[PDB]
Every structure is written in structure tokens, then in C-alpha cells.
């Protein structure tokens, strides 16, 4: 058995991992960008 964590590896440099302890309740996520050109 190789005890490997998602943080112990190098793939997490691509993903900012934040622990949300209630994710079954989120129906949907959203984010708004406003680019002024």
C-alpha cells in the first residue's frame, strides 16, 4: 500500500483545494467575471 495524498503529490499545484464541509447541499456553484475592455 502506498499512502498517497492529493496534497502530497504535485497535481495540486494545478488546483487550489479548499475544504467545503457541506458539498451535498450545494445545488450549483457560480462565479461572475466582469471584464472591462
Amino acid at each position: 500500500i502506498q499512502y498517497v495524498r492529493f496534497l502530497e503529490t504535485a497535481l495540486a499545484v494545478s488546483c487550489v483545494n479548499t475544504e467545503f464541509k457541506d458539498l451535498s447541499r450545494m445545488i450549483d456553484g457560480k462565479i461572475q467575471f466582469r471584464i472591462s475592455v
Partner: protein, 46 residues
Amino acid sequence: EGVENRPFPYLTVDADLLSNLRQSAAEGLFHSFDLLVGKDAREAGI
């Protein structure tokens, strides 16, 4: 679309998002987007 146009405290980051932007939105890379030209570029009313 699903875009909300209500005003917001738009947090300002320093990354230049707009590398080949208007060609991308006229091609529709984004799922859902709103082109606001001129008078509608303000904060809408509460």
C-alpha cells in the same frame, strides 16, 4: 441567460483576462455571457 447583472463589489485582480477576448465571445467559448455596450455598462438598479 443565467447571467445576473446586479451590481457587486467587483474584486480587482491583476491578471489580464482579455487575451483574444472579443473574438472568443463572438465564437462562444463561454457557456453564457452578456455583451454590454454603451449605456447598459452601468450598475443596474437595486
